[PDB]
Hints:
- Its EC number is 3.6.5.2.
- It holds the Pfam family Ras.
- 35% of the residues lie in helices and 25% in strands.
- By secondary structure, it is of the alpha/beta class.
- It has one domain (1-139): 3-Layer(aba) Sandwich (Rossmann fold), CATH 3.40.50.
- The strands form two sheets. It has a four-stranded parallel sheet with strand order 1-4-5-6, sandwiched between helices.
- 37% of the residues are buried.
Amino acid sequence: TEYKLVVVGAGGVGKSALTIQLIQNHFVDSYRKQVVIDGETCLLDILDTAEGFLCVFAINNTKSFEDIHQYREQIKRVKDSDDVPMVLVGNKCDLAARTVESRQAQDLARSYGIPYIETSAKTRQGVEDAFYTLVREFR
Ligand SMILES: Nc1nc2c(ncn2[C@@H]2O[C@H](COP(=O)(O)OP(=O)(O)O)[C@@H](O)[C@H]2O)c(=O)[nH]1
């Protein structure tokens, strides 16, 4: 179950930090892990890049947010669908240096028909929520 939770974003947004937090539960390749989400026991196979896509930007990195659009166009163009499980993640919410406003990310996730989750991989704030939210978009 559950290919491939491909985690994709601009360098240094926190794709590695988020994933290892999920798998290895510590703040610092592919991973497979049996999880329970809303009662179901399923397998996450997670591709941390260097079926479902976790699209990550950093809330202090404006370029990494504007890159979101290219990732989306490349996803619609490869799955031939405007409904492929995908979640927009605003990482690094623990920082005060926010150049990307919550509303912007949300208005973008809106026009895509996809959820938006603000996260911190440093604190584990909202990490399960982001991945588990990606799985719920399959259902
Ligand atoms: N303050 C803060 N720093 C972070 C967060 N996520 C990642 N980092 C830092 O950003 C650096 C690079 O992030 P990384 O996990 O390598 O993202 P990746 O290169 O896209 O895989 C790491 O040294 C982390 O310590 C976060 O949520 N908050």
